[PDB]
Amino acid sequence: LTPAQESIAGTGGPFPENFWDPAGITSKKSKEEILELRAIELKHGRVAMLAVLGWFHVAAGFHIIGDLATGTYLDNNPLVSVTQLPMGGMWQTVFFIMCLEWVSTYVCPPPKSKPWDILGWSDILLEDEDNYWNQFRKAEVQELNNGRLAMMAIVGLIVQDIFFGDFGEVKVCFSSQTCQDIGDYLPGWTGPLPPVAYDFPPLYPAPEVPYTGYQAPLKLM
Amino acid sequence: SHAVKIYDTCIGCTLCVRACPTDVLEMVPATVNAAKQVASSPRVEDCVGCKRCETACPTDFLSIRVYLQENEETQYSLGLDLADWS
Amino acid sequence: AIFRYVNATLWSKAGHFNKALSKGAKTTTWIWNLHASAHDFDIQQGSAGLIARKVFSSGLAHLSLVFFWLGGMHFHGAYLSNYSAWLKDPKSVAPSSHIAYSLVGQDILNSYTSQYFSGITITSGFFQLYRSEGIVTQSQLKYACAASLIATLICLSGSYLHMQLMSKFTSFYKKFQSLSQSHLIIMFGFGSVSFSAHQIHEALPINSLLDSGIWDPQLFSAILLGTPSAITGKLLNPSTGSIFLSQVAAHHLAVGIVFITLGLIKWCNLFFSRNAILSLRLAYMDYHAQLSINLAVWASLSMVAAHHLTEIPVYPYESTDYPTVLCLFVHHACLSGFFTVASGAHASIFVIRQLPTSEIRHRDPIIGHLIWVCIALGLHSFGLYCHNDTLEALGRPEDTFCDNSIQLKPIFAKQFLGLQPGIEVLDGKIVRMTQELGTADFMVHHIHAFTIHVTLLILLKGVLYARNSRLVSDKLELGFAYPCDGPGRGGTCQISPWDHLFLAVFWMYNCLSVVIFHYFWKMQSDVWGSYVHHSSLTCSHYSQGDFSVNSITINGWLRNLLWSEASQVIQSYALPSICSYGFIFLAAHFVWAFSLMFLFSGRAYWQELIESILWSHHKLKIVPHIQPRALSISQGRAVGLTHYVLGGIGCTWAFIISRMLVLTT
Amino acid sequence: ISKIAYLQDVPRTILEADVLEKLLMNTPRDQWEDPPEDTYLYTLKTFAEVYGPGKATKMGWWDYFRLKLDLPPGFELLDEDEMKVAADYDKLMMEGKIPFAVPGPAGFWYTGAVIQWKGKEQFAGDQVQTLTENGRFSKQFLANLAFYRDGLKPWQRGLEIGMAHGYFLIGPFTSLGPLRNTPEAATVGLLCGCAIVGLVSIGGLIFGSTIKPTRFDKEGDKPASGFIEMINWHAIGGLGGAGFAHALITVFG
Ligand code: CLA
Ligand SMILES: CC1=C(C#C/C(C)=C/C=C/C(C)=C/C=C/C=C(C)/C=C/C=C(C)/C=C/[C@@]23O[C@]2(C)C[C@@H](O)CC3(C)C)C(C)(C)C[C@H](O)C1
Ligand SMILES: CC1=C(/C=C/C(C)=C/C=C/C(C)=C/C=C/C=C(C)/C=C/C=C(C)/C=C/C2=C(C)CCCC2(C)C)C(C)(C)CCC1
Ligand SMILES: CC1=C(C/C=C(\C)CCC[C@H](C)CCC[C@H](C)CCCC(C)C)C(=O)c2ccccc2C1=O
DSSP, X not given: OOTTGGGSTTSBSXXXXXXXXXXXXXXXXXXXXXXXXXXXXXXXXXXXXXXXXXXXXXXTSOOHHHHHHHTSOOOSSHHHHHHHSOHHHHHHHHHHHXXXXXXXXXXXXXXXXXXXXXXXXXTTBOSSOOXXXXXXXXXXXXXXXXXXXXXXXXXXXXXXXXXXXXXXXXXXXXXXXXXXXHHHHSTTOOSSSOOOOOOOOOSSOOXXXXXXXXXXXXXXX | OOEEEEOTTOOOOOHHXXXXXXXXXXXXXXXXXXXXXXXXXXXXXGOOOOOHHHHHOOSSSOSEEEEOOSTTOOHHHHTOOSSOOO | XXXXXXXXXXXXXXXXXOGGGOSOOSBHHHHHHHHHHTTOGGGSSSOHHHHHHHHHHHHHHHHHHHHHHHHXXXXXXXXXXXXXXXXXXXXXXXXXXXXXXXXXXXXXXXXXXXXXXXXXOXXXXXXXXXXXXXXXXXXXXXXXXXXXXXXXXXXXXXXXXXXXXXXXXXXXXXXXXXXXXXXXXXXXXXXXXXXXXXXXXXXXXXXXXXXXXXXXXXXXXXXXXXXXXXXXXXXXXTTTOSOOHHHHHHHHHHHHHHHHHHHHHHHTTOOOOOHHHHHHHHHTXXXXXXXXXXXXXXXXXXXXXXXXXXXXXXXTTTTTOHHHHHHHHHHHHHHHHHHHHHHHHHHHHXXXXXXXXXXXXXXXXXXXXXXXXXXXXXXXHHHHHHHHHHHHXXXXXXXXXXXXXXXXXXXXXXXXXXXXXXXXXXXXXXXXXXXOOOHHHHHHHHHHHHHHHHHHHHHHHHHHTSSOOSSOSOHHHHOSSOSOSOSXXXXXXXXXXXXXXXXXXXXXXXXXXXXXXXXXHHHHHHTOSEEEOOOOOEXXXXXXXXXXXXXXXXXXXXXXXXXXXXXXXXXXXXXXXXXXXXXXXXXXXXXXXXXXXXXXXXXXXXXXXXXXXXXXXXXXXOOOSSBOOOXXXXXXXXXXXXXXXXXXXXXXXXXXXXXXXXXXX | OTTOSTTTTOOTTTSOHHHHHHHHHHSOGGGSSSOOTTSHHHHHHHHHTTBSTTSBOXXXXXXXXXXXXXXXXXXXXXXXXXXXXXXXXXXXXXXXXXXXXXXXXXXXXXXXXXXXXXXXXXXXXXXXOOHHHHSHHHHHHHHTSTTTOTTOOHHHHHHHHHHHHHHHHHHHHXXXXXXXXXXXXXXXXXXXXXHHXXXXXXXXXXXXXXXXXXXXXXXXXXXXXXXXXXXXXXXXXXXXXXXXXXXXXXXXX
């Protein structure tokens, strides 16, 4: 690596200790540029995690603010629900996020050393503590990996919805969806027993002619 | 503040002094009893009024009496912690 | 192992266990302290081995007591009950395994239950339990009673033996890994599997025959035979109005398998996050810590039982046996509350006797935010009721919070069963019906949350401020159960965890009374009742669906629930069935009022009155050398609390049971 | 260790070698000499002093059964990693650092972070650090509130606070008032909001007349002059904000 690249080493790749960079984008960058890239990555990852959460939440139904605002049940497809939502709510959402960004970037700007530290953890946190109960690196890598996966997932969901109208419908099966049957609950099921195409034969033959005091084996049927 | 008074029935067993939570009392030399000492109350300003001295007094009726004075309550007698009157 | 040291010599000492009782019987406070500290094995003479001995042997003795009680129940069912008439026709005949004497005209208590039987209608659901178990013969009930008595004798022998088998070296009670593994795999897993086996092999054929109508001895002495593919719980037995017992047996088999699997993965160490719980594992290896945790667990399980025994029907005909379901719910809710306050108490005791966990070091924010949430919850939830009352009195219903007026819709209260439209009925009664939630349900649920949070506030404050506080810094030295620290520092009354429980019990009782009233009124108004004729039925409910219209006001609660539904209990004197319930209503009112004596008064007045009275005894030469004394401060509080709770619970008990008995008969 | 007589050549039947090693590791070193009465090591000492080589080589079946019942198995005692984790936890707490956790459903999760629980003043309970109040974001936000913002005159502080207060205060009466359905709902709500602003400003004037805070006062000025100015301008700003909200409601329906 390089002195600039080391500013984020240990928080990337499949294992934390790797540095995945096939394009070599960060090879020539300076430490400030690397920190800004990490800040962009973390902001995108967090926004993508929240976006996937909300996307699945609205695709399961559960879209009450929109339902009440429009006086009607909005389409489960989130991209359709965006258009179904009132401009009032849309501009309110945009304005609220704008206010959050303004506060986070002008009133309470994160430190230049940790541009991703929005909540100001690096004023009471002790990252360089040699205790066992100091898995902040684990927490950071979990955050980054989940955020990257959520970025890919949300982009895929949006692209698939735009192309084939498939929004990754969720089958929560409890409140918005009324599942009447065991087959509805578990695919391929039609009865109490699992849908196995194997008829379990008797391990031992039975007597064709019984005798007093037999007690033939019971059948689950 | 409360009024902690000591009467000559005192036998100087020191139990009041040992039970004091804020060290209001102290044994002083005397000739009235066989133990040759009687409890005193010099730091009555710190008395909170818990009557633990009174609980620990052996005599038939107490040789130490704590008279509560709610009108003259001070921060020391109230055990104020979060607020300061000093 | 050495049984030569167990002699009846100590029986007459009466206080040997406590060293503080050595100066025997100088006053009546000595008697009261003897009773109070009888079972406080920790502070008694001996060693830790003796403490463990006493704890385990007492647990076994109580096990024997419970087995004796169950055997008595079985015997009463067998010989002093109309179980035969109930089994052949449950609807017509009310359960009754309880008969009263004809001493002073007391035969009036017995009421018509069957043609040949007269007695007191039981509300424990024991008949339904027997029917589910497949017990259909007096011989079977008699052998169940014999088994219960044998278990009682075995447990008594085990307690007596373990009082000496366990020595100071004994450590089997400290093997928490072994204890938990054994309980999880054998007591729970194997137990559930074995009970599923019992159901499949005994109860399923008998119950199927009973549903069909067959009562043949040869038959009484092919799983999934009648159950369709419908999800369990989505289809109730049309002829019984309860979940299929084959589904119940499959449930128990699955639960046992799951418990065995959990135990085996724990055995193999598959669970990995041991460190997250290691702190609790090290801290809570204490008698009182385990007692508190277990009491809370069983309180929560009792509350879940109270809810499920009614909402989810599994016993035959218990759904239509309205007194039974109501009494089961109320009883288990009360037990939940009592065991929760118990968990708080023993958490406080553990904090006093052992080192607390580190969440006690920021206790001020915790209790401060709990205080704020309690205040806000109470304000909003109860002030909605007060607003409704004031506005309705002023004559502005449009300004109140109700379904017709401003409405607080419970948006989050969403279905999960996915049941089909309609209701389930069985012989002129509504076995199952969906509860429709509105503004009244919103308000009452937030009242529930408020009361729960205030009780939790009291318990948590007692637990966290047990060792010390800003007021008094040596509360640990003071101990667990002391009345105060003195009139000083303004006054330190009821600063002890014992007194914190003494108040949390009042608040738990208030919460549970509101819960009982909510359940009772909602079920009467919106669930229970009869029906009058694809077919559509008009459902005539016992309370006539007045919960949603009248429950929005405290006046509505006072009038439509207490006054209106107290007609049965208040007018029960002439009626043979419920005259006892009316008398118990009156007597419980008396006891509750009598508790206020101890709750309001103080020790010194009674001590001075006792001395003035004793003057006359001394004058006449009646000198009691166990000098009479007024009850201690803590004892007065305990007596007042006990009488208060008992009186309130008795009034509610008689009121609800009288109403249900009269309405159903 | 070799210096301990009863720990020498303990027979395998009484206690396995591995379990004995684990028990010794778990027990504090100082207790090996003479362990307390209620400990596995005490039981082992008492029974090894009586049984083993050169002593009773046999035991009754029941006595041996009880001995194996009351001696510890290997899995009952803590492991090396578990003891290390517990020691690290205790060391952190005693050093004044807190392995951060947030309460969850009937429990609390560990976030993997170590914070500095104790503040600059170690004995001060006001200064214990928390992200809510002592984090960088919270510090900046609170410092940038109007009450605290740097380079603000008291009239500016009061005007901004009152603008906010009146603007949000008019709404509750407008929407949920007795005359909420009448055509004058907005105006009546504006009147009620202005009344509330006036009442709170009167309360603030009482506060500044009685306690007389002097944090906003200019040098060489009457005490509480800055606070009273801020409260008067809060009343003005509340009137203005209530009027602006009412105007917006009226104009845009
Ligand atoms: C906002 C997006 C974003 C940003 C700013 C970064 C930034 C960073 N990542 Mg990357 N990363 C992202 C998303 C992003 N990542 C995603 C979604 C994944 C999952 C595949 C990863 C997986 C990943 C790993 C495994 C590692 C990094 C690492 C890094 C750092 C060094 C490598 C580099 O130069 O990356 C710069 C990245 C970019 C400039 C993004 C370029 C994207 C191109 C233009 C393609 C975009 C197309 C996309 C598929 C969308 C198409 C949609 C359309 C069809 C509609 C750097 C801070 C390394 C690290 O932290 O080492 C310590 C590291 O090891 N990242
Ligand atoms: C790292 C690296 C490389 C790389 C790379 C790659 C593949 C990068 C990919 C990055 C990617 C794919 C980043 C996505 C961000 C997505 C966001 C912010 C989504 C927001 C989503 C939002 C705001 C969603 C909003 C809503 O849905 C909500 C919540 C509910 C709906 O009702 C309404 C709408 C729809 C509005 C190279 C190329 C190999 C070079 C180098 O060598 C190493
Ligand atoms: C936490 C949270 C939140 C919150 C929020 C808030 C709290 C807000 C506020 C808001 C507000 C509270 C606003 C206000 C505004 C105001 C304004 C905008 C005003 C204005 C005014 C004016 C303009 C005035 C003027 C005047 C005057 C001053 C005087 C003279 C006259 C006149 C008229 C000129 C939310 C919900 C987001 C969600 C998430 C979370
Ligand atoms: C009444 C009262 C007393 C005086 C009460 C005493 C001394 C209790 C009397 C005990 C008796 C002797 C126990 C015997 C039981 C009853 C006599 C049983 C009556 C049963 C009827 C059915 C006949 C206190 O000492 C006291 C102390 C602190 C707070 C409140 C109070 C308080 O309220």
